[PDB]
Amino acid sequence: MPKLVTWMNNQRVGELTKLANGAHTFKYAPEWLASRYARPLSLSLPLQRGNITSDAVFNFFDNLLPDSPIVRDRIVKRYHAKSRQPFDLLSEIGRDSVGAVTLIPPIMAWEKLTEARLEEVLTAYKGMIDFRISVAGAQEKTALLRIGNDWCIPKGITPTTHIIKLPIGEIRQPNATLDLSQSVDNEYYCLLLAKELGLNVPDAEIIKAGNVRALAVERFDRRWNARRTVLLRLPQEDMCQTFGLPSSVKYESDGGPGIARIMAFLMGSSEALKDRYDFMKFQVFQWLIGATDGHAKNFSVFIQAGGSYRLTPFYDIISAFPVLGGTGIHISDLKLAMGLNASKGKKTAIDKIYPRHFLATAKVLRFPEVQMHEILSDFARMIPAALDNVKTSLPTDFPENVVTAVESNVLRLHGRLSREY
Numbered sequence: 001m002p003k004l005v006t007w008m009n010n011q012r013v014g015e016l017t018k019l020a021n022g023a024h025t026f027k028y029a030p031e032w033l034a035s036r037y038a039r040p041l042s043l044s045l046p047l048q049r050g051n052i053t054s055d056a057v058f059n060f061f062d063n064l065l066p067d068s069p070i071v072r073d074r075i076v077k078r079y080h081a082k083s084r085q086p087f088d089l090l091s092e093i094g095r096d097s098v099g100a101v102t103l104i105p106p107i108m109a110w111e112k113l114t115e116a117r118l119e120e121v122l123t124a125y126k127g128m129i130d131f132r133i134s135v136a137g138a139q140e141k142t143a144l145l146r147i148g149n150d151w152c153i154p155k156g157i158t159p160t161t162h163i164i165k166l167p168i169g170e171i172r173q174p175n176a177t178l179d180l181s182q183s184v185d186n187e188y189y190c191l192l193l194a195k196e197l198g199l200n201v202p203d204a205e206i207i208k209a210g211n212v213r214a215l216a217v218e219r220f221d222r223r224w225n226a227r228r229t230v231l232l233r234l235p236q237e238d239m240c241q242t243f244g245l246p247s248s249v250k251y252e253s254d255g256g257p258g259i260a261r262i263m264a265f266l267m268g269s270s271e272a273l274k275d276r277y278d279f280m281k282f283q284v285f286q287w288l289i290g291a292t293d294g295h296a297k298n299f300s301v302f303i304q305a306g307g308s309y310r311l312t313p314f315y316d317i318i319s320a321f322p323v324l325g326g327t328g329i330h331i332s333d334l335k336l337a338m339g340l341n342a343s344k345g346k347k348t349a350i351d352k353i354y355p356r357h358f359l360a361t362a363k364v365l366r367f368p369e370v371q372m373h374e375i376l377s378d379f380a381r382m383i384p385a386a387l388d389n390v391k392t393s394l395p396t397d398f399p400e401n402v403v404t405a406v407e408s409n410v411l412r413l414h415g416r417l418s419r420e421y
């Protein structure tokens with residue numbers, strides 16, 4: 001299989017190919033391995049000489065594309081590719097993927113979009129199909145460059161600064177109707193509550209183009225230089241990749257990594273203490289806001305010079321509370337993607353989970369009890385105000401049902417905190 005030079009911003013990293021036998025390989029650029037400021041494209045693909053044939057090569061690149069066959073078919077369609085295989089895919093849109101793995105078979109420009117043209121691109125992304133927000137597996141992610149107060153499409157190899165998500169819509173199941181038509185407002189809101197609570201998350205703005213409302217989340221794998229002259233891409237990978245696992249096992253119930261393996265893995269981070277504290281805090285947070293899709297691919301690390309790594313901010317944060325009620329799901333069905341320790345097993349029922357459960361997990365993970373307590377205690381006295389602040393800071397066209405669905409359910413859980421801290 002032909003080549004596609006792998007680039008990290010403006011540096012040649014290596015080359016990728018494939019074989020007709022069904023195998024895949026990658027090779028590092030000798031001058032890359034010779035630089036003192038070199039670093040592996042993936043922790044699962046250690047810096048080395050000679051092509052790499054391990055499955056980690058395919059998995060890494062295969063984790064760069066949506067794990068949904070439905071979604072891939074669309075891409076393979078509007079782009080015409082041999083098949084759904086990574087290469088054919090990345091050989092078309094690998095110019096602005098996740099991280100800094102720019103692929104290509106002289107720039108610094110873009111193209112502003114009219115409000116009419118903006119609504120044109122967004123609409124380009126959008127029957128009858130263990131609850132998970134991404135069950136429809138029919139949500140195509142896109143990106144756009146934001147210059148000032150305008151939305152533009154990067155021109156050339158120019159990077160994007162925002163990840164764009166359109167409404168998931170209502171999912172029709174045989175015995176249930178999942179109302180995720182307000183997933184944009186959901187995440188927007190959830191990202192504000194997370195920030196207000198001191199969590200490391202990106203900022204997000206709701207795009208208004210025509211009658212379609214979308215979510216624009218700043219990419220933390222990008223960064224403007226001091227003179228706003230160049231927009232740099234930053235190396236990054238998710239837990240599946242770093243562990244050399246396929247996206248098919250991102251969930252723990254499917255054999256994927258849980259809280260234990262990641263916490264242990266973070267002990268080798270350049271910010272071990274901080275990263276373990278933050279990760280653990282996000283678990284309590286997910287529980288509080290009813291975030292059920294905290295799978296392995298929902299956590300990533302920044303690859304730094306020398307092969308050192310550290311936790312990246314948290315992302316794709318969506319509450320399941322808004323989907324509660326009527327013909328939808330019920331609290332009793334809300335389960336964390338990564339279970340906690342139980343008296344004689346695991347706890348995943350957000351409804352049957354209390355402070356004691358998090359404290360029990362910390363102890364076994366060797367996470368300072370005094371820290372777990374501080375996390376529980378900190379939410380106990382900040383949640384009440386946090387909610388109101390977020391609210392009194394929301395637009396006027398923001399749906400009450402969403403805030404009510406989240407706030408109430410949040411205060412309902414937060415009660416178990418105050419009555420202990």
Ligand SMILES: Nc1ncnc2[nH]cnc12
Pocket residue numbers: 098163202217218219220221315316
């Ligand atoms: N905001 C973000 N920044 C970088 N990578 C992302 N992946 C998903 N959301 C992201």
